[PDB]
């Protein structure tokens, strides 16, 4: 989703065709750290926001195609907004800054 290559906002499960009531139908009663790719509309139409819900603080999360930069950056240089986030999905995102306190459970891939 920027030049002809396609992997960050649209990676493996990263779809964005799920809105407010249809995301809630398989979400916030069970959800304690499940991360899944939600359609927005606010600054016109926002197709690639990501949404994880923790049952308590239920709170969405922005992507962006390849803009974040996390890894050993000399010969192969790193540019990924998920690589900074995935380090703290390995443990607890409240030790980052966002008050979620969650590990990776399971993505809702194509509903």
């Amino acid at each position: 989703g920027m030049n002809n290559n396609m992997s960050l906002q649209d990676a493996e499960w990263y779809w964005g065709d799920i809105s407010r009531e249809e995301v809630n139908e398989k979400l916030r009663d069970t959800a304690d750290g499940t991360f899944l790719v939600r359609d927005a509309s606010t600054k016109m139409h926002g197709d690639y926001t990501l949404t994880l819900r923790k049952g308590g603080n239920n709170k969405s999360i922005k992507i962006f195609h390849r803009d974040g930069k996390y890894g050993f950056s000399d010969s192969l240089t790193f540019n990924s907004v998920v690589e900074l986030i995935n380090h703290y999905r390995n443990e607890s995102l409240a030790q980052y800054n966002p008050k979620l306190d969650v590990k990776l459970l399971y993505p809702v891939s194509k509903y």
């Binding site: 407010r20 995301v23 606010t42 926001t49 999360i61 992507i63």
Partner: peptide, 8 residues
């Protein structure tokens, strides 16, 4: 709060 919070 189930809509939109743009974190990155």
């Amino acid at each position: 709060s189930v809509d939109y919070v743009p974190m990155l």
